[PDB]
Design an enzyme around this catalytic site. Structure first.
Site, mmCIF file in Angstrom:
data_model
loop_
_atom_site.group_PDB
_atom_site.id
_atom_site.type_symbol
_atom_site.label_atom_id
_atom_site.label_comp_id
_atom_site.label_asym_id
_atom_site.label_seq_id
_atom_site.Cartn_x
_atom_site.Cartn_y
_atom_site.Cartn_z
ATOM 1 N N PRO A 275 112.993 29.988 -42.331
ATOM 2 C CG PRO A 275 115.290 30.252 -42.756
ATOM 3 C CD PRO A 275 114.269 30.391 -41.680
ATOM 4 C CD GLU B 65 123.893 31.872 -37.056
ATOM 5 O OE1 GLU B 65 123.970 30.714 -37.496
ATOM 6 O OE2 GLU B 65 124.067 32.885 -37.748
ATOM 7 C CG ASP C 268 94.778 40.163 -56.025
ATOM 8 O OD1 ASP C 268 94.874 41.222 -56.704
ATOM 9 O OD2 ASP C 268 94.540 40.154 -54.789
ATOM 10 N NE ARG D 143 95.957 42.665 -51.110
ATOM 11 C CZ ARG D 143 95.330 41.914 -52.010
ATOM 12 N NH1 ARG D 143 95.273 40.595 -51.864
ATOM 13 N NH2 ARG D 143 94.750 42.477 -53.060
HETATM 14 N N1 SFG Z 1 112.834 33.358 -45.417
HETATM 15 C C1 SFG Z 1 112.392 33.494 -44.158
HETATM 16 N N2 SFG Z 1 111.081 33.363 -43.912
HETATM 17 C C2 SFG Z 1 110.600 33.484 -42.613
HETATM 18 N N3 SFG Z 1 111.522 33.807 -41.622
HETATM 19 C C3 SFG Z 1 112.835 33.977 -41.919
HETATM 20 C C4 SFG Z 1 113.272 33.832 -43.191
HETATM 21 N N4 SFG Z 1 114.607 34.050 -43.178
HETATM 22 C C5 SFG Z 1 114.982 34.302 -41.910
HETATM 23 N N5 SFG Z 1 113.897 34.219 -41.122
HETATM 24 C C6 SFG Z 1 113.806 34.540 -39.683
HETATM 25 O O1 SFG Z 1 115.036 35.146 -39.277
HETATM 26 C C7 SFG Z 1 115.548 34.461 -38.099
HETATM 27 C C8 SFG Z 1 117.086 34.553 -37.945
HETATM 28 C C9 SFG Z 1 117.884 34.063 -39.160
HETATM 29 N N6 SFG Z 1 119.050 34.930 -39.389
HETATM 30 C C10 SFG Z 1 118.399 32.670 -38.850
HETATM 31 C C11 SFG Z 1 118.272 31.767 -40.067
HETATM 32 C C12 SFG Z 1 118.974 30.440 -39.766
HETATM 33 N N7 SFG Z 1 120.414 30.639 -39.504
HETATM 34 C C13 SFG Z 1 118.724 29.442 -40.926
HETATM 35 O O2 SFG Z 1 119.589 29.380 -41.835
HETATM 36 O O3 SFG Z 1 117.661 28.772 -40.877
HETATM 37 C C14 SFG Z 1 115.006 33.069 -38.238
HETATM 38 O O4 SFG Z 1 114.984 32.426 -36.963
HETATM 39 C C15 SFG Z 1 113.607 33.357 -38.760
HETATM 40 O O5 SFG Z 1 112.764 33.810 -37.701
HETATM 41 N N1 SFG Z 2 104.478 38.816 -53.513
HETATM 42 C C1 SFG Z 2 104.908 40.043 -53.830
HETATM 43 N N2 SFG Z 2 106.207 40.246 -54.051
HETATM 44 C C2 SFG Z 2 106.668 41.514 -54.387
HETATM 45 N N3 SFG Z 2 105.730 42.542 -54.426
HETATM 46 C C3 SFG Z 2 104.434 42.303 -54.166
HETATM 47 C C4 SFG Z 2 104.020 41.061 -53.850
HETATM 48 N N4 SFG Z 2 102.695 41.134 -53.636
HETATM 49 C C5 SFG Z 2 102.302 42.388 -53.867
HETATM 50 N N5 SFG Z 2 103.368 43.108 -54.221
HETATM 51 C C6 SFG Z 2 103.426 44.571 -54.444
HETATM 52 O O1 SFG Z 2 102.192 45.144 -54.031
HETATM 53 C C7 SFG Z 2 101.652 45.963 -55.089
HETATM 54 C C8 SFG Z 2 100.115 46.065 -55.080
HETATM 55 C C9 SFG Z 2 99.362 44.732 -55.124
HETATM 56 N N6 SFG Z 2 98.186 44.783 -54.253
HETATM 57 C C10 SFG Z 2 98.883 44.531 -56.558
HETATM 58 C C11 SFG Z 2 99.061 43.078 -56.982
HETATM 59 C C12 SFG Z 2 98.349 42.851 -58.319
HETATM 60 N N7 SFG Z 2 96.906 43.120 -58.244
HETATM 61 C C13 SFG Z 2 98.598 41.427 -58.814
HETATM 62 O O2 SFG Z 2 97.756 40.544 -58.549
HETATM 63 O O3 SFG Z 2 99.648 41.249 -59.463
HETATM 64 C C14 SFG Z 2 102.221 45.349 -56.351
HETATM 65 O O4 SFG Z 2 102.199 46.297 -57.449
HETATM 66 C C15 SFG Z 2 103.623 45.000 -55.889
HETATM 67 O O5 SFG Z 2 104.415 46.172 -55.852
HETATM 68 MN MN MN Z 3 122.800 30.101 -40.626
HETATM 69 MN MN MN Z 4 94.790 43.021 -59.805
#
Ligand code: SFG
Ligand code: SFG
Ligand code: MN
Ligand code: MN
Ligand code: MN
Ligand code: NA
Ligand code: NA
Lengths: 244, 241
Positions: free
Chosen positions: A92, A119, A168, A157
């Site tokens: 994150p 963690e 898109d 994609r």
């Molecule tokens: N939003 C995110 N986007 C990408 N990876 C995520 C995300 N949230 C959690 N992770 C993954 O989940 C793992 C375990 C997490 N519970 C730890 C998060 C950590 N305690 C923090 O606050 O940064 C992290 O080491 C990441 O690999």
């Molecule tokens: N970033 C996103 N966050 C949440 N849902 C997503 C996300 N990207 C794609 N989706 C889901 O994937 C479905 C199919 C997508 N390929 C279509 C996206 C659409 N053509 C656009 O550009 O808004 C969408 O109807 C959403 O349900």
């Molecule tokens: Mn934490």
């Molecule tokens: Mn579209």
């Protein structure tokens, strides 16, 4: 294959969600994508060592050890072969994933995704072996497995022959227009007449105005980084005065 | 159960990633979370089970047809029972999911997540049946299944007894270290090996503050930086090459 992906995860069998279903499954079958997993527990010092251990200084949870991870990455690099493998840690605290980022990642030969758990992973592993850190958004999940699958699905994609990715949301900084299908009338709601009887310029213009309007209502920050033109300013001004 | 979740998806098998693994699997077992799927392909009247149809106005791709979706939501709303179910559509056009959003969603008794496919779902379905639209970020995925699992996983962590965080109280987390004390000529910070709780508490807060400043200064602007934090962050900045 066009793109080779290696995933470093303690739950490789979770990745069946992308390998057995959707575009990712089809790309594997079509040979556009190679997807492989590398379990760090198979790389511990000996079979009596866990991937995780206690955090130094106290505090809650466990931290993933550097040795199991270093083993899995070494073995994954070896399998990448002659490909230029970019080592990504899903965190994150990394670079926020955007469509522009997805287009950049889609140009790589090989990607080694490190899916953290507990963690997190030891900072000395990130300092030494990780090339870039990526986030899927500003929230905390329990592991980096769903984030790694999010990256793989978005990137796949954009692989030639995988699927429109040039119609898109976030492509030209705008959100997409609404989509309609059969029937022409459903629950006292009819499909806009321009879609039913308009020409391909009326449709192009209505679709651009709706995209501009939706982006203005929901994602104004998207327009600040995307200077509108005179046509767009006029179509958007019309949307605003006509939204009701 | 504390939280009931109903998912409307053409690939209910994909949801094994959350039902068989981690906190979500644990919460289902512990009874904190009820997770159910509703395949629109089962609410279709043909031999090949069609959910898609051609888009009006032309253009590429398919749009998800209303009748299959209508069916699956009706059946899901019936199973929610007496719970106040919030119908969410996963869309890149929805409200960007943040930790503050995750805290809000974690207060709901029931959630009906609609996982789109193809080019999207018909706008008239969203206008009629969807309460709020949520995005996981500024990128496009092929379906709303990974986004729905992202929502469920983030929300489940906040359920009492399911398990400070990187987007709680503004700051990002501090670095984490584990055994050995020294690895490949790299030692764990001495504060962590010392044993003084206040030294560790302040070093950890300073590193969080410092990491947030370096990477996510935007998070800091929208934060009430105390005198203690201003001093610890000033120290982090001035004491680096
Ligand atoms: N939003 C995110 N986007 C990408 N990876 C995520 C995300 N949230 C959690 N992770 C993954 O989940 C793992 C375990 C997490 N519970 C730890 C998060 C950590 N305690 C923090 O606050 O940064 C992290 O080491 C990441 O690999
Ligand atoms: N970033 C996103 N966050 C949440 N849902 C997503 C996300 N990207 C794609 N989706 C889901 O994937 C479905 C199919 C997508 N390929 C279509 C996206 C659409 N053509 C656009 O550009 O808004 C969408 O109807 C959403 O349900
Ligand atoms: Mn934490
Ligand atoms: Mn579209
Ligand atoms: Mn309408
Ligand atoms: Na027609
Ligand atoms: Na902290």
């Amino acid at each position: 294959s066009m793109l080779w992906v290696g995933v470093v995860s303690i739950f490789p069998e979770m990745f069946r969600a992308i390998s057995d279903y959707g575009i990712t499954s089809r790309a594997v079958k079509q040979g556009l994508l190679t997807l492989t997993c590398w379990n760090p527990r198979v790389y511990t010092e000996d079979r009596h060592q866990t991937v995780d251990d206690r955090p130094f200084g106290g505090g809650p949870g466990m931290v993933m050890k550097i040795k199991p991870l270093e083993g899995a990455l070494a073995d994954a690099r070896q399998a990448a072969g002659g490909r230029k493998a970019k080592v990504i840690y899903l965190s994150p605290q990394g670079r926020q994933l955007t469509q522009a980022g997805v287009r950049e990642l889609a140009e790589e030969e090989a990607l080694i995704l490190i899916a953290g758990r507990y963690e997190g992973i030891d900072e000395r592993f990130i300092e030494e072996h990780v090339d870039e850190e990526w986030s899927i958004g500003d929230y905390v999940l329990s592991g980096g497995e769903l984030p790694a699958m999010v990256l793989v699905d978005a990137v796949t994609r954009l692989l030639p022959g995988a699927l429109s990715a040039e119609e898109d949301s976030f492509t030209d900084g705008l959100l997409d227009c609404p989509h309609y299908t059969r029937p022409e009338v459903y629950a006292d709601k009819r499909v806009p007449e321009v879609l039913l009887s308009g020409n391909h310029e009326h449709i192009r213009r209505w679709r651009l105005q709706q995209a501009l309007g939706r982006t203005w209502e929901r994602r104004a920050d998207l327009l600040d980084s995307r200077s509108l033109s005179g046509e767009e300013q006029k179509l958007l001004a019309e949307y605003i005065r006509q939204r009701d």
